[PDB]
Amino acid sequence: NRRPKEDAFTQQRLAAINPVLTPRTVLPLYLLIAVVFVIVGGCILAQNSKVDEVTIYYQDCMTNATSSWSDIPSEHWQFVFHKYKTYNTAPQWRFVDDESDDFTKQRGTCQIRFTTPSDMKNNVYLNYVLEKFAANHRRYVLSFSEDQIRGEDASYETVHDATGINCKPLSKNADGKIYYPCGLIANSMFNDTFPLQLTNVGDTSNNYSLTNKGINWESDKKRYKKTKYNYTQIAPPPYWEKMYPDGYNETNIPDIQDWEEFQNWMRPGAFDKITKLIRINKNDTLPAGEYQLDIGLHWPVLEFNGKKGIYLTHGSHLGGRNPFLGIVYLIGGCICAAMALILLTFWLFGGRKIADASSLSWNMK
Amino acid sequence: TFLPKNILFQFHNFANVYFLVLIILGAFQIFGVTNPGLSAVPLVVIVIITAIKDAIEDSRRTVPTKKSRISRELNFSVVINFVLLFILCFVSGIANGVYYDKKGRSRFSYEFGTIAGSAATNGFVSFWVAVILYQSLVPISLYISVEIIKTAQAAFIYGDVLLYNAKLDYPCTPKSWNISDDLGQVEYIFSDKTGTLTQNVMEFKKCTINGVSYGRAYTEALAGLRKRQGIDVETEGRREKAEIAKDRDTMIDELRALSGNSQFYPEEVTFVSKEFVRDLKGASGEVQQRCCEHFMLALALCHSVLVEANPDNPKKLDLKAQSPDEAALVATARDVGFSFVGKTKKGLIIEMQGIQKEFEILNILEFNSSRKRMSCIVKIPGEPRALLICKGADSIIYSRLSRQSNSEAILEKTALHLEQYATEGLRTLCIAQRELSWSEYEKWNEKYDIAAASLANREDELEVVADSIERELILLGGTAIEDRLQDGVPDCIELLAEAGIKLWVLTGDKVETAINIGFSCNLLNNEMELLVIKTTGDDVKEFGSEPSEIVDALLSKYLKEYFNLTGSEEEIFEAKKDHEFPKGNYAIVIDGDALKLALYGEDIRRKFLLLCKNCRAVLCCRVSPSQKAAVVKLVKDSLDVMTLAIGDGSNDVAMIQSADVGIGIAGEEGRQAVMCSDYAIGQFRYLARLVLVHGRWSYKRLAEMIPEFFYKNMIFALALFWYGIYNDFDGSYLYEYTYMMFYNLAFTSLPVIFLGILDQDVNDTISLVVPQLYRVGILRKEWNQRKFLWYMLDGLYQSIICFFFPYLVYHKNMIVTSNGLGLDHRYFVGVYVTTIAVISCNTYVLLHQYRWDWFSGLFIALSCLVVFAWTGIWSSAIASREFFKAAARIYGAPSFWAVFFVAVLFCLLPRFTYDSFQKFFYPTDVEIVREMWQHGHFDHYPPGYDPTDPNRPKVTK
Ligand SMILES: *[C@@H]1O[C@H](CO)[C@@H](O[C@@H]2O[C@H](CO)[C@@H](O[C@H]3O[C@H](CO)[C@@H](O)[C@H](O)[C@@H]3O)[C@H](O)[C@H]2NC(C)=O)[C@H](O)[C@H]1NC(C)=O
Ligand SMILES: *[C@@H]1O[C@H](CO)[C@@H](O[C@@H]2O[C@H](CO)[C@@H](O)[C@H](O)[C@H]2NC(C)=O)[C@H](O)[C@H]1NC(C)=O
Ligand SMILES: *[C@@H]1O[C@H](CO)[C@@H](O[C@@H]2O[C@H](CO)[C@@H](O)[C@H](O)[C@H]2NC(C)=O)[C@H](O)[C@H]1NC(C)=O
Ligand SMILES: *[C@@H]1O[C@H](CO)[C@@H](O)[C@H](O)[C@H]1NC(C)=O
Ligand SMILES: *[C@@H]1O[C@H](CO)[C@@H](O)[C@H](O)[C@H]1NC(C)=O
Ligand SMILES: [Mg+2]
Hints:
Helix content of chain A: 10-25%
Bound molecules: a molecule of 3 linked components (NAG-NAG-MAN), a molecule of 2 linked components (NAG-NAG), 2-acetamido-2-deoxy-beta-D-glucopyranose, magnesium ion
Largest interface: A-B, 110 and 107 residues
Region (Involved in phosphatidylcholine substrate selection) (chain B): 30-37, 111-115
Site (Involved in the release of the transported lipid into the cytosolic leaflet) (chain B): 140
Binding site for Mg(2+) (chain B): 192, 194, 648, 652
Strand order of the largest sheet of chain A: 3-5-6-13-9-10
PDB class: translocase
Radius of gyration of chain A: 30 Å
Oligomer: heterodimer
Number of helices of chain A: 9
Number of helices of chain B: 39
Strand content of chain B: 5-15%
Strand order of the largest sheet of chain B: 1-21-20-19-2-15-18-17-16
Structural class of chain B: alpha/beta
Number of strands of chain B: 22
GO molecular function (chain B): ATP binding; ATP hydrolysis activity; ATPase-coupled intramembrane lipid transporter activity; glycosylceramide flippase activity; identical protein binding; magnesium ion binding; phosphatidylcholine flippase activity; phosphatidylcholine floppase activity
Helix content of chain B: 40-55%
Number of domains of chain A: 2
């Protein structure tokens, strides 16, 4: 015959619940979410207030800093210490020009002294901070070569005529050599030289030491590899021609696997503010005191009104200091509570009967 | 026959050519920002799916096309969607040009870019890169999703078991798998009577033999007359049917006691005259006995039925006739004890009272639609004579009488019996004999032979000989056959009238018997006015002189008196907008000539349509197929409304094809009304279960499913637009390409498809118990364009949230990790945004589902988990270039989960708060019914409960 198969699925009689939301059921959920979100928001905000930070913008060093120590203008630094809400103690800086270098646009050394009145746990991060550097534009972000990154000796056609991800504008030099790190991304790397330690001004016997081994995810060493090129087929990018004035000979080819500032740079920041770890310390607390940082100015930003700076923190579990998560958890819990109160008011004032057939749209009229 | 036609029919849309342009722009005119080899996966997969599904469609069609109203609204929705996408791309291009205008930036230094004079050129390139950027804002899976949903709904309509009629072995086979939702907005039903509402098997009920009217029965037209008068038809009928059942039992007992019949079967006996079964023996004597036996002999001989052995038992016969009334007559004459068996070379064989006897049929003047009669000359051996027996209409016979050989004493009482039968609602016949002596028969036979020897349209000479010979007749009496309603037709009609559906019954029967059968069917009930447009003499002589103006006057009066408006174009335009069930309980009754003269002229058509806009019930009497098609098209074309037309036969096929939904009533033989239809049900009863349950379901399912889609994709798409603000609308992607393809392929598709397939606001039992829930589908509240606009506004707001919450967690110092390492690549903010958007969309779909069944819940959970698992699986593979460990670095950050949970809360709080405010202080009828269901008001009804089944137990209230 043709009798349709009696089956809980084909007859649309699946096992199910039919949730009708009566105030006795919804209002408890509103109150529950309000309570838990207010608690979590207060916890996040309280745990976040304990986060102290130091931000210093040193892009104005080559012109504002002098040869003798001087206070940093109030526009360039931001201190946030939670034990001392009223601690200005402005930092100082001093410029040490370098007439030997013929790159008059950015050269010398900026020396910054800052006074931290409290410690910095034991895991201290020193990032740099670029502002108004557009690293998210269509052609820029696609301008590298995942064949060179992975270490292949890709020829000019694999490097130039590959698909969407290809270093087109900086594929080749005049002499006929492929740029080893090719593309606008690897070529425009950040160039300031950061110190391997924070000089202690008071007691110069205990210097706070920093490192550059551990500033990038370890897993990234599975994607970057030591090249297999031959030092005769490759030449530095057009902007690395002060670091390699003679080109790549048998020793100076940069191993990009153990070079984590490169690996941090090859991850183009999504937005206009860029914050990349450059120094770390995982062992010692940073005791209160007056410390000195010597940065070697190499990277020009005043051409496009950009900014460069240092950002020193211990951080948190939610990252740096950002009151957004706690603020928004509090607002969410309080909006849930307010709406529960409004619904309960309108219910205890003008609440209809629940299962009243007399209210149906046809039984009414 | 598959590849060319299918690929062309697929690319004949706008979304498909748009995506093909995108493929060609990514591959042939590649600017440098695309993964082309894989960006062609959505197009090719949807093309292959549509090709397979349409191959199955054409295969089902092999072993005209209609489109629902939802489809045209869907076209308008897609147009508005494209308008939004164009506005987005326009703003992207304009802002990128205004940006490239600036003369000092990071690019002149580090990007090796120059000032391309007349920055409009880079603006143009940016417009055409944003056209490809905002892919997901093109609704491309929308049409294949709607097709999958409609096919699944039609498969459910097919495989439903409460629609399969076991007697016919015929489930409700759909012939159009894309109008399920049109089934849910039916506002008018046009139904032929004779074959649809009444089982087209005529049963012999009464007969007036020699002025003695034998027969007792309770007909539905008699019950309707009693109901309209006011007598308690329930008790009246209970008493009458009990009495007649006892009488039938005793009648069969007396019949068995009379004589031994070999071809007697009590199950198909329908003559219920105890008076006849008692008078056949001795009650009136010998003359009435002879009259009855002659009536039976003539009834069992004058026919054209061909008999064959019953497949169950070869001794039983099947009585295969062409017309049902002749079959009924021969069957009742056999069951009374005058059986007819076999058909030899000369005449036929009658078993009378148990003995065989043969006859000699000479000339069968067969039945013709223009002759309205069937005559036959048999040879009676004994010195054989001729017997010319003719069966026809009452007026047909009364026109051909003899000037002397009429009793005029039996004639008056037989005419009274015939009029009483016509009033009680039966089809009457008339039977007349002629005895021909040997000499006169020889003369007439030679004349008939020499007349039939004339070829070249022998029909004319044949009819003139018939006129000359059949002018003198001796009538014996009349018969009466009955057409019973189908099981559950009154219940189905009251259900469809409670639902708010206006019902039209197109009859071929007289006006008064049609009104009686309507009162019996509950089409008309008491406390319901009957606006009659009969063109009888009483109204003719009072209104006018000629028809076609009496009907106009009557329409004007029945308008101006029982409402306050007149027939006008502005009133038509006004009533076009309202769909409310009418109040006042009025009904129309109209004759064939009145319907013709109301369809003739334009102003009269306008008046008739405005009068039938109200008046939930309309009866039309003695109509033609052309008139059926005309009334259906008048109600549909003007007064744009959704119409169903249910029928059988070969005129209701023209009635069916000219209607939004066409339902064919399947007979034991596949018919034209079944074939050239949209659905095909066994009995009219099933129409209730279909139209309500599935209709409504489908309609709601699609309604709520379509804006859902138009919202879900929007979220994702618009997030890219927002990242445009922070990358200067330059065209870099915030999402990975696998994200951008799978958000529509796998991440958010099954939730909305299962919402459209499996959702149920209330189960079928409540759907059939509270039929008024249909009224919303009649009023077109569940699917407007305002609903789609509100869903798109909600999608815009939720996209704002899903982007700017991760952005705001970054914006302060771009450090969101616990170990100070970097997550600032834009693919990682894209993972943030994508996870928030997917979970928000799926929880939105879940909150807007009415019934949380385990299939839908499992697949919503699986869509969310598959987002997480795809991130985890694509990262852990080195083939993801800049996306290497997005999983292990993002899903391990408490910042991620903090933003995730609070952003899902902020996306779902406005809509859930509004839904709560609604369900509390302005609840709809389905919410009130779901509360009454939770409190347990519908616990006594069994799970599968059809209130239109006679073999069902009644409930408390
Ligand atoms: C550190 O990175 C700096 C950022 O790119 C880089 O600056 C670039 O230096 C090159 C030369 O080394 C300049 O190239 C052009 O300089 C002038 C001006 O056009 C021309 O006369 C030269 O022939 C050459 O074409 C780049 O203009 C300059 N980039 C910017 C944005 O100013 C430093 O060189 C790097 N220094 C070290 C020590 O690594
Ligand atoms: C801490 O750092 C300071 C950085 O200057 C070191 O001081 C220098 O020590 C070298 C010895 O090789 C001298 O030649 C320099 O003149 C010193 N510079 C200054 C500014 O004093 C100091 O040695 C470090 N502390 C320890 C314990 O090594
Ligand atoms: C923290 O202590 C660890 C372990 O003592 C230091 O890691 C070693 O550093 C030395 C140089 O100082 C290297 O030669 C070793 O290869 C490192 N080993 C490992 C396993 O990392 C780390 O340098 C110390 N950090 C600071 C800021 O001094
Ligand atoms: C530091 O820069 C500000 C801003 O240009 C300027 O007003 C001020 O004089 C500068 N100070 C020195 C010492 O150059
Ligand atoms: C390799 O190149 C570097 C470039 O700075 C140079 O200092 C070094 O002496 C070179 N080595 C040899 C062996 O030439
Ligand atoms: Mg019919």
